[PDB]
Amino acid sequence: VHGHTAEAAEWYVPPEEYPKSGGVKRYLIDASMVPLSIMCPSYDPVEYT
Amino acid sequence: SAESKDSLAALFSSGTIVARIYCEDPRNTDNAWVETTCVNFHDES
């Protein structure tokens, strides 16, 4: 009917603005780069407490 | 028909292969014969 598969495991990516943090934003990553089996060399997360 | 087609995809999401048999097809010969796989799509609702 469609012409492809589903091709989506429904991987979760949280929203950019952290709640109740006064506008502090994470480092945005796509849903196809989240798993630890995948390499992803450009991963630079922000440390916030 | 877009979303109705998606509905059809929902229809196509639950199919059971019920049989894989030899056809009694009148076009059959000694060197070429038809064998069928039957797929049943049942709509319960």
Coordinates of C-alpha atoms in Angstrom, one line a residue:
Chain A
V1 CA 0.0 0.0 0.0
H2 CA 2.7 2.5 1.1
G3 CA 5.8 1.3 -0.7
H4 CA 8.2 1.1 2.2
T5 CA 8.4 -0.5 5.6
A6 CA 7.6 1.1 9.0
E7 CA 11.4 1.8 9.6
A8 CA 10.8 3.4 13.0
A9 CA 11.3 1.9 16.5
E10 CA 9.8 5.1 18.0
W11 CA 13.1 6.4 19.5
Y12 CA 12.7 9.1 22.1
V13 CA 14.4 12.5 21.9
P14 CA 13.5 15.0 24.8
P15 CA 12.5 18.6 24.1
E16 CA 15.3 21.3 23.7
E17 CA 14.3 23.5 26.7
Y18 CA 14.8 21.8 30.1
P19 CA 11.7 22.3 32.4
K20 CA 12.0 24.8 35.3
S21 CA 15.7 25.6 34.5
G22 CA 15.2 29.2 33.4
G23 CA 15.8 28.7 29.7
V24 CA 18.8 26.4 29.7
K25 CA 18.9 24.3 26.5
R26 CA 20.5 20.9 25.7
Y27 CA 22.6 19.9 22.7
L28 CA 20.1 18.8 20.0
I29 CA 20.5 15.3 18.5
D30 CA 18.4 13.5 15.9
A31 CA 16.3 10.3 16.7
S32 CA 18.5 8.2 14.4
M33 CA 21.7 8.8 16.4
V34 CA 20.5 8.0 20.0
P35 CA 21.6 4.2 20.5
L36 CA 24.9 3.3 22.1
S37 CA 25.7 0.7 19.4
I38 CA 25.9 3.5 16.9
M39 CA 29.1 5.5 17.0
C40 CA 28.0 9.2 16.7
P41 CA 31.4 11.1 16.9
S42 CA 29.9 14.6 17.1
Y43 CA 28.2 14.0 20.6
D44 CA 29.0 16.9 22.9
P45 CA 26.4 17.1 25.7
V46 CA 26.1 19.9 28.2
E47 CA 26.6 19.4 32.0
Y48 CA 23.9 21.1 34.0
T49 CA 22.7 20.6 37.6
Chain B
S1 CA -6.9 7.9 -0.9
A2 CA -4.3 8.7 1.8
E3 CA -5.7 8.0 5.3
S4 CA -8.4 5.5 4.0
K5 CA -5.4 3.7 2.4
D6 CA -3.8 3.8 5.9
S7 CA -7.1 2.1 7.1
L8 CA -6.5 -0.4 4.3
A9 CA -3.0 -0.9 5.7
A10 CA -4.7 -1.6 9.1
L11 CA -6.8 -4.1 7.2
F12 CA -3.5 -5.5 5.7
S13 CA -1.8 -5.5 9.1
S14 CA -3.4 -8.8 10.3
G15 CA -3.1 -11.6 7.7
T16 CA -2.8 -15.4 8.2
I17 CA -1.4 -17.8 5.6
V18 CA -4.1 -20.5 5.7
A19 CA -2.9 -22.9 2.9
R20 CA -0.2 -23.6 0.3
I21 CA -1.7 -26.1 -2.1
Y22 CA -1.6 -27.2 -5.8
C23 CA -4.1 -25.6 -8.2
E24 CA -6.6 -27.5 -10.4
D25 CA -6.1 -24.7 -13.0
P26 CA -7.1 -25.6 -16.6
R27 CA -4.0 -23.8 -18.0
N28 CA -1.7 -26.3 -16.3
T29 CA 0.7 -28.6 -18.3
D30 CA 3.3 -31.2 -17.6
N31 CA 6.2 -28.7 -17.5
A32 CA 4.4 -25.7 -15.9
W33 CA 1.9 -25.8 -13.1
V34 CA 0.3 -23.3 -10.7
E35 CA 0.7 -23.7 -6.9
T36 CA -1.0 -21.1 -4.7
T37 CA -0.3 -19.5 -1.3
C38 CA -3.6 -18.2 0.2
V39 CA -3.5 -15.2 2.5
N40 CA -6.7 -14.4 4.5
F41 CA -7.5 -10.9 5.7
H42 CA -10.4 -11.1 8.2
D43 CA -12.2 -8.0 9.3
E44 CA -13.7 -8.8 12.8
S45 CA -15.3 -5.4 13.4

